Nucleic acid binder design. Structure first.
Lengths: 158, 88, 71, 135, 86, 131, 156
RNA sequence: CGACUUUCUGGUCUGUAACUGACGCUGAUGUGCGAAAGCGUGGGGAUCAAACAGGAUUAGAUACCCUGGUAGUCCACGCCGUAAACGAUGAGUGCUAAGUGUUAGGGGGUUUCCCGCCCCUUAGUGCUGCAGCUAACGCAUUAAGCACUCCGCCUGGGGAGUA
RNA sequence: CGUAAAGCGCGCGUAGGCGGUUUUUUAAGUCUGAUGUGAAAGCCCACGGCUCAACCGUGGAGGGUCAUUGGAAACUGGAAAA
RNA sequence: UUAGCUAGUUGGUAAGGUAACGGCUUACCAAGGCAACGAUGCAUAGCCGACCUGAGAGGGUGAUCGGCCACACUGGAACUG
């Protein structure tokens, strides 16, 4: 979709070698539509423009669907990856999406209105936003199973 | 030692049906004879650890079989512990 | 694997033997130095290998076999 | 743990100990009864003053002093801050603070309100350093 | 005061080593605050058998009638299951 | 010891979920039979079957995977497990993933689904969560 | 070693009394896995101002800055102690007639021998302190022969 | 826990289903068993062996390089109960791609003993690896995957296993 | 607890922990209401006053793991039957 | 790093005694009676309603205010009503 970049930070990774100490400005960008699509990316560079270039290029490739109702997930689940797990839940309107900073940016690049959420386990942004993308890729909808199950909506339904 | 000779000898009697393999009455009789034999061995084998562990587990399992015979039955248990003279 | 040696030489023997009644089969069981051709290079199953080995080691203790053999 | 052993156990936390032994007056001046008073301040005197030296490169010479508060419990405490007019056996107020200067001590004096008078030449002591608004 | 059920307690007679007095152990179990699993716990009840007619293993109900001695509180109401080796 | 039937039932169901096959059978109980019928009602088990043999008859399940052998359901777990005899009254009925997620509950008459539970409003021992 | 630290005592006792004209009553060093802690009790006047500690510490540190026969660098603890002193000699008690002292005497009270009083006058072994214990006033003659431990105390 | 043997027993499993009818479960307390050293006693001492000393070395030399010898090691029981007893993988339960062995089993067909083959599991112990999961490492039917009753620990480092 | 902190050294086993398949009863639980009964206030909700707020007040809600009884027999626990 | 407590104690007998109750206390006879599911001992403590932080779970707290309990220099009493 319309690619909207979202980097988390720029770490310099000093790959010190024989002699010199080569530090690469490493930055991971997440590219999304904030309207039902998002995708993360990784890039190791020596500067902000090179890093954003490469990581946005990587991020716009892999995307997601972000199935929502009221612009919000029809269900509630939690995301987990490598002990960087995070928890998610919808929220009543006007309350706003609440989550830790970086994963909050992830979910606004999914474009949600009101969410119960909080980061857990690891505070490393990469790991926790990866648990986040796992969870978001593990969303479904009532119609999906109303098809999948022979039974339909309005009898076994959110 | 024992083998099935004295086993069957002492199961000839307490079998609710002579083809049974539960109803530990005959079976606990076998266990009684065998623990007696292994205790003779233990008096022969003054120091070890196999006789100790074996007697532990065997007598405990037979004890629990009795407890069952006291829960499953109420008279068979006593009549054994007076006839067999074990786990009274 | 595993790393045992040839079997089916029991085409006229088995499953349990001998222990001692043919010194010549024992000539082929293990080495002749007193050292033991391992189960790695003897072959029969650890049950039969172990029983044959204790047979030959008894023969050593039985003087039917030398414990160690010289040259 | 298993549910039963969980029941026959409290699952005790790892509750800490206050690294500031701030046992304020409590029952010190009657019955000499030990009492965990958490007062932010007790009045008391530094019977002796001193000065340990820091190592290189930052030879930021820090000065200490041993003090007794209302409970009169011995401790060697460093003085921070620039400027003073007190001496041996001067009454001093000590606040809880552990700094990078020297172990064996976890408290610190405060400037401005007692014998260790602060300096009103700076503007940071506008609400603190014991000194009034620099007017 | 029979309208008042007093304090009846079905339970087993555990001892009678008192003059005309027995002890009924009536079993209960209390909830856990954090958890919800428990085990059976009870309160022994020094109780007056009118002639120490009770026996060990006697499942029996009783009746709070009067403080009869030290912790001797509950009269027997009816011997339910006076038992011997079963 | 096979302490709980729910636990082994659900762990082997999740194992089949991983292995992506449908035809599997297992020693049942009357409750296992009834809940398997509830499963076929839910659908994600395309077919269930019960016979009798030692000791309880083998319940025979034949799953309804997705169009591409995907779990129509997402998650599955026991609730009433050894030691934890956990009950839910009329209002104590939970709603895993609301209607989409479901859970049978044993009640004073029998085992009923979450829809039945909040429908006839008889609580009971909540059994196992599936979503 | 102890001989070494004594040598530093003589070499650095020069500064102390050409700088702040103090005298070191001693220099002793304690160590806990790092540059040890040479506490030098600097004397001169009794009521040493903190500045009179800062400047003296400057002097002694500069003195040893170029002087350290001891191979490693170490913490200089520059101490300008107060009048508080262990009273072993009778003159130690005589000087302290102004200030309170606490003593541990062969005849204790309530198990332990240590008691603090504020001296009113000097009377050989006998004591006319305004000893204050449990908020109690009195002049109690503590026999020095009883005294197993005696130290001049803080004035508070 | 390996020289051989026996003692009089403890345990191992294939198949077995024999049938009372859950008799099962881990297991606080308790509690046995238990490297080595050490040691009490009573012997041995074959080594070995601290300490040791002769003695290099060097005022010093046991420091080590010597020479011998050395408590004890070794026999009787206790004390010893401790360790790297470590997989820092409690036990049992049963599920779950494979390839792919073992250690005993069994069966079927396969063929002269298929022993020869294959394959099915029995019950373990492999290596690679589905999935899964771990920071990583890797396990992965013998999970570190999935679950379940029951035990203990862990709470920064270390202070100090020490008081 | 595969390695950063954690599996005795390893046992036997008392209590106890949980409890196989099926058939009934029980209602103990369990669930499932009715009762009495949860000072008050605060407590949440609404609302009244105080300019308003603060605030009290008003009522409601909430508030037992309490006792009792209505069903119920899935389940665990019994009871019985294998 | 709190495991035995335990003798009017245990129970009854008779007396008394109190609103009652009973070792409640006397005399009797008898030996109990509790004890790891932690008695006992020690520290400590007013109690709760309530309150603070916590999404909550929870944790923590226990100012006035509601009540309940304990005390009134110290101990030993008792008159009164």
């Amino acid at each position: 979709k319309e690619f909207e970049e979202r980097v988390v930070t720029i770490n310099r990774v000093a790959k010190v070698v024989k002699g010199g100490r080569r530090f690469r400005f490493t930055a991971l960008v997440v590219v999304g539509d904030k309207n039902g699509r998002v995708g993360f990316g990784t890039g190791k560079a020596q500067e902000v423009p090179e890093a954003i270039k490469k990581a946005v290029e990587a991020a716009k490739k892999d995307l997601v669907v972000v199935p929502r109702v009221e612009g919000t997930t029809p269900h509630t689940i939690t995301g987990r990856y490598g002990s960087g797990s995070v928890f998610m839940k919808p929220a009543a309107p006007g309350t706003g999406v609440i989550a830790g900073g970086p994963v909050r940016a992830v979910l606004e690049l999914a474009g949600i209105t009101d969410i119960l959420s909080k980061s857990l386990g690891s505070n490393t942004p990469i790991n926790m936003v990866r648990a986040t993308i796992d969870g978001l890729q593990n969303l479904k909808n009532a119609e999906d199973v109303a098809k999948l199950r022979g039974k339909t909506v309005e009898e076994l339904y959110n | 030692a024992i083998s099935q000779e004295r086993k069957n000898e002492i199961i000839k009697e307490y079998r609710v049906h002579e083809t049974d393999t539960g109803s530990p009455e005959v079976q606990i009789a076998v266990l009684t004879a065998e623990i007696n034999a292994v205790n003779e061995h233990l008096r022969t084998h003054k120091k070890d650890h196999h006789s100790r562990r074996g007697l532990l587990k065997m007598v405990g399992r037979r004890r629990h079989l009795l407890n069952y015979l006291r829960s499953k039955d109420i008279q068979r248990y006593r009549e054994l512990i007076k006839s067999l003279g074990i786990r009274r | 694997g595993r790393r045992r040696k040839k079997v089916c030489y029991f085409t006229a023997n088995g499953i349990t033997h001998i222990d001692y009644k043919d010194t010549e089969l024992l000539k082929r069981f293990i080495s002749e130095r007193g050292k033991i051709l391992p189960r790695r290079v003897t072959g029969t199953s650890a049950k039969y290998q172990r029983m044959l080995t204790t047979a030959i080691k008894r023969s050593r203790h039985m003087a039917l076999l030398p414990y160690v053999k010289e040259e | 743990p298993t549910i039963n052993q969980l029941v026959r156990k409290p699952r005790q936390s790892k509750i800490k100990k206050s690294d500031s032994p701030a046992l304020n007056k409590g029952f010190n001046s009657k019955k000499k009864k030990f009492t965990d008073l958490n007062s932010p301040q007790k009045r008391g005197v530094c019977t002796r003053v001193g000065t340990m030296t820091p190592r290189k490169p930052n030879s930021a010479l820090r000065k200490y002093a041993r003090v007794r508060l209302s409970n009169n419990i011995e401790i060697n405490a460093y003085i921070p801050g620039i400027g003073h007019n007190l001496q041996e056996h001067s009454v001093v107020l000590v606040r809880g603070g552990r700094v990078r200067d020297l172990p064996g001590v976890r408290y610190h004096i405060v400037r401005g309100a007692l014998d260790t008078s602060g300096v009103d030449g700076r503007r940071q002591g506008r609400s603190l350093y014991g000194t009034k608004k620099p007017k | 005061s029979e309208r008042n059920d007093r304090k009846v307690y079905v339970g087993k007679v555990v001892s009678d080593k008192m003059d005309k007095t027995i002890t009924v152990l009536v079993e209960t179990y209390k909830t856990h605050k954090l958890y919800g699993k428990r085990v059976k716990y009870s309160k022994k009840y020094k109780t007056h058998d009118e002639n120490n007619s009770a026996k060990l293993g006697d499942i029996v109900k009783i009746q709070e009638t009067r403080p009869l001695s030290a912790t001797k509180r509950f009269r027997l109401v009816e011997i339910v299951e006076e038992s011997v080796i079963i | 010891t096979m302490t709980d039937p729910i636990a082994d039932m659900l762990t082997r169901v999740r194992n089949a979920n991983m292995v992506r096959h449908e035809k599997l059978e297992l020693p049942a109980s009357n409750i296992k039979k009834e809940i398997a019928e509830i499963l076929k009602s839910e659908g994600f088990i395309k077919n269930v079957e019960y016979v009798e043999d030692d000791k309880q008859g083998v319940l025979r399940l034949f799953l309804k995977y997705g169009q591409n052998d995907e779990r129509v359901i997402t998650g599955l777990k026991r609730i009433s497990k050894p030691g934890l005899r956990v009950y839910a009254k009329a209002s104590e009925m939970p709603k895993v993933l609301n209607g989409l997620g479901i859970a049978l509950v044993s009640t004073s008459e029998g085992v009923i689904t979450d829809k039945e539970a909040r429908k006839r409003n008889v609580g009971g021992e909540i059994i196992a969560y599936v979503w | 070693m102890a001989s070494k630290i004594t040598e530093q005592v003589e070499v650095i006792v020069k500064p102390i009394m050409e700088d702040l004209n103090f005298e070191l009553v001693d220099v002793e060093y304690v160590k806990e896995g790092r540059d040890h802690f040479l506490r030098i009790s600097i004397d001169k006047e009794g009521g040493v101002d903190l500045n009179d500690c800062t400047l003296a510490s400057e002097k002694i540190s500069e003195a040893m800055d170029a002087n350290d026969p001891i191979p490693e660098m170490y913490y200089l603890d520059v101490a300008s102690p107060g009048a508080e002193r262990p009273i072993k000699k009778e003159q130690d008690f005589q000087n302290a007639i102004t200030k309170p002292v606490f003593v541990s005497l062969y005849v204790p009270i309530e198990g332990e021998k240590e008691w603090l009083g504020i001296l009113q006058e000097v009377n050989n072994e006998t004591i006319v302190v305004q000893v204050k214990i449990k908020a109690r006033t009195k002049d109690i003659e503590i026999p020095r022969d009883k005294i197993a431990k005696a130290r001049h105390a803080v004035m508070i």
